[PDB]
Symmetry: D3
């Protein structure tokens, strides 16, 4: 019996799952694996079974935004998933240090969403599993891929208006490294559901400089590949522990 919105069965769910926001990215990633098996595609949720380094793990798209990815995350977590790693893009909150193309492996996030709050009080931290976190950094090292580490601001607001000030600058001063829209939700759902989570992101611009055109419609080819290698490598290594 398929999951309400992912449209896959519990038996099709592997212990390690790699989630991305763009359903089209799932097709781009499956092709770089040793082999793959398409499972389903419903709404913005595309699921494919990946095979990498003799290891097996799913790759599912969660779509844009916290409320949307929460549906995906909850279905994965409540049906077998043990490790969920989000791989996506992000904006730099430190323009003088982190730039387009750079990779950042995050261990925690700012809960600027609503669903995590509807799940647990705001004082609760949005934090990833440090073993998952460690696995990601090690894979990066072994591949000789320099990366940044830090906190990501997960905000439900992509396009700000001019009435209520955005908190991005505050968080930049607070030393948050990047900003995206799903990590915190994944992390909180993960801890509440005893699922190990992690996150690796690649910068595609800086929201502080969008007016000056500091935004790339497309990610830096070379680096996107490196990040995916890191991500796949990690999932493989982590999967080995449940095989």
């Amino acid at each position: 019996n398929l999951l309400r919105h992912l449209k896959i069965s519990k038996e099709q769910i592997t212990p390690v799952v790699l989630v991305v926001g763009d359903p089209g990215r799932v097709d781009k990633i499956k092709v770089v694996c040793d082999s793959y098996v398409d499972l389903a595609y419903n709404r913005e949720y595309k699921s494919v079974e990946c095979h990498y380094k003799g290891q097996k793990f799913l790759c599912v798209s969660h779509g844009v935004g916290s409320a949307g990815c929460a549906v995906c995350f909850e279905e994965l977590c409540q049906n077998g998933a043990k490790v969920i790693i989000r791989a996506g893009s992000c904006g730099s909150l430190q323009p003088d240090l982190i730039k387009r193309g750079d990779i950042c492996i995050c261990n925690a996030a700012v809960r600027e969403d609503r669903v995590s709050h509807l799940l647990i009080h705001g004082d609760f931290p949005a934090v990833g599993d440090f073993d998952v976190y460690d696995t990601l950094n090690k894979c990066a090292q072994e591949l000789n891929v320099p990366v940044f580490n830090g906190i990501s601001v997960s905000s439900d607001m992509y396009y700000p208006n001019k009435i209520i000030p955005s908190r991005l600058e505050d968080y930049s001063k607070a030393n948050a490294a990047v900003v995206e829209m799903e990590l915190a939700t994944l992390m909180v759902i993960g801890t509440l559901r005893k699922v190990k989570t992690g996150g690796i992101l690649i910068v595609d611009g800086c929201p502080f400089k969008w007016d000056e055109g500091d935004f790339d419609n497309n990610l830096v080819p070379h680096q996107l590949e490196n990040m995916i290698k890191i991500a796949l490598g990690a999932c493989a290594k982590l999967a080995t522990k449940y095989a």
Copy 2:
């Protein structure tokens, strides 16, 4: 250039736009019109130009969740859209009155999201445009399609937990009619950017009884058809004026 994430151009945006959640729903709607022209399909945002009753209007999918649909709505509102109508599914909060298949035309909504709050203080109301509301009702009447009218709870939480209590029962007692995940965001964004909004929904179950099987993976055919006719009819009438 094209809209950053919708991947359509400014000149391709019609004054009137029909938005739905499932990108697949867009293809099912375009084939009911007299003719159409596929525009783009990026992530969960599928855009198509619809031709119905001599009128021209777009149909765009916004995806699941307030943060994701916010990306879609902002691009549309900041690039020419004058009227946006959301057509989707919802759950009944008045099970003894509103049942599966029933249709509800909502005039306002509960802002249980975060993005709208990041845009304007919570005391501000999520309310639709009367003209659009009235147009939708006048079309249902002409088609002899009975509908309900009321407030929708737009909540970011689809799958509740056992720690923090859901506010759905409170809102039911407060006389809210249904519950879905995007209307309040559409409304507030519309108001802030001077875009007229409206919404028509079809009940697919009751959240108070999911644990009892009250959920249709498939919507009621005739009802869904009648809702789309109303939706399409409403868009045609409004488009005429702007034409």
Copy 3:
């Protein structure tokens, strides 16, 4: 027995009720009707039965402020009232477009009070009934009286301080049309008590320019008379339907 604070019996309550802020305004209004019957006068709550176009409906003063009018509204809603229309004065939040004398028929409001929050969560919208809004607009048409439509900011703070910044500016940018002190409370109570509500206001100045003398201790003669015609006309139309 009599309503605790209105000092009128339940049987003296008509399905349609017109409420104003100033108890003295009730006298100024009872005169222009065909005839009337004074019911009571307790504190700032003055009740009178009005006879207009062969229709019976009460006119009750509610006083200044959300907490005060809430007492009035609850006693009415819980004892027979089916429709309540507030007619009063307001300040303009769009000075370049809305000026002294202008009439605005509002469909929703900003809940900047406390009592509505003590009744239901802040995410809940303060929105009036569509028929009442429609009825009021049409009556304005019939009488060839140009009127604005929009959202009203209902704030418990009339005289601002210099420590905590007023939110009026924010709301003006958010496109709120006018500002008064009781509409949101009326709307929420009505929605909760299944009572259709509506509001029509006359501009007596702009709070952004009070330091410039932009305030009329006396409302515009013809304009006020016109608004009153509209209100009475609307009450008449609605009372007929309930008979």
Copy 4:
């Protein structure tokens, strides 16, 4: 130069001012003084200069509710008033100890309004001036009138609904003595404007027992007489000091 809503000049404002909720109560009080001079009556605000023991001080009605009384209090504080004492009715939050007829002199209050919050952060205390509190108690002492002392809950909600629970039971457990609707607002405005405030109240019932009829529409005559004696005595003594 009349005050916008009180309709009196800054010249008619005495340093000490006695405020009551009911404009009718002002008349019942002025005739118990040596002499009086009616000043004005607008909306629910009736002003009268009271003469007592050779002392001159005003008695003004402020209406029901924090938002409404705030207009009164600001106009008075911003135009001369140096001392403001509120004399009114209240409900008992300690049914086994405080009953109908009993008098309570309050030194502080719970800010369950909105206007005090729009003026200053919530953490700020609603507290009366010790001097006024002390004089009121001493006057009660001299007249041999027993009285309670304690905290009053100033809540904007008089008639509660059944969705959001009331905080009255919580405050009763916290040892709040009484409940009314204007004291917290007077205290905060007083502190902010450098005006000494105080409040004396007579119990008319218990909200926990309204369903039992524990509410007297009429205040115990003798008790009310004694309270006003205490109030007028205090106003005279304080008036002397400011002479």
Copy 5:
């Protein structure tokens, strides 16, 4: 049986207790009394039974901070204490009037802590007992020591950052007189536990001018002695009553 953290038995607790922040201060106080008896010293909590003017009362240190002092206060309140007077240092929020070495007796405080909020809603006031307040002022008058009276801001943040603005300026404008870190917590716990509280503080600088070196590592010698005399004098007077 000994209290968990104060390490004294319930029988050793006197009806009146003088509390100070620094355990070192306890020792400096006991020697100024007629005679004393050391009870215990655990963590930062030092207890000593003081004998003064033929009266008996304890002097206990509560440490720096609301959370830390709450532990001390609860153990005292839940085990026999009837009166608790805090004597400590503070910063001036009115640099034009209250200078270093000046003494302020406070009647209420701003609740900028967390513990009091975990105990009761924020709207509840942090207010001291009148009798204790009055006793402190009378002892000051008898000793011919001029003192200020006013509200204290009890803030958990001593060293502010540059991201979130400090509320001290707002409170100075709201007329708060001084700032320290434990009074509000004492007051709220006292009210809840029916224990009479008070506070007397000596100014050690002004947080608005720390960058100008406006801070005394050592309190004004004579002033500190004067304050302690007032403090001990008050405890003696209040202790007599329970004796």
Copy 6:
């Protein structure tokens, strides 16, 4: 000059610091090190330079409560500290798995304080540094000391009351491991000041079973000894990175 409250100079602060709550604890710790140098003891803040396994690092007591420890943490972070590890006691929030004497190395915390909120928005996470977390775990491993890992609830309330429900059960359900009073504050301050933090705690009871006598007057001897060895070992390892 000296730090205002720690009373040590900037030059006396080592890059790595070990903080504990009880000042008496640093004397019990310094004695197990190779040698030490007492620096100062002011209020509840005792500082001693420890020499262990060829490295030098300070051991400083911070007292009970977040507000108090923030003073200590801020003085250290703004004056040279690069690594701060907290070693203290805690309560078990999972009494069926974590019992008296068990050791828990925490990587994140619940911000149930106030000071962290006065420094940065609540959505920000309280999370420790991975290097520190990893070092602590590796040291426990080397010493064959089993330990738990998890989130700690840092709450300013030690003794709850019966009015406002404690959120501990909620956090237990959310899978928080233990509860104490200072970790979250240390974490947030460190993230903001660019200082690496960590925490290791020994369980001395369970808040859910205090009434049934589930409290440890004294920490389990051999377990406390082991945790101290782990903490001292971690500090030395981290210190070498700055030697």
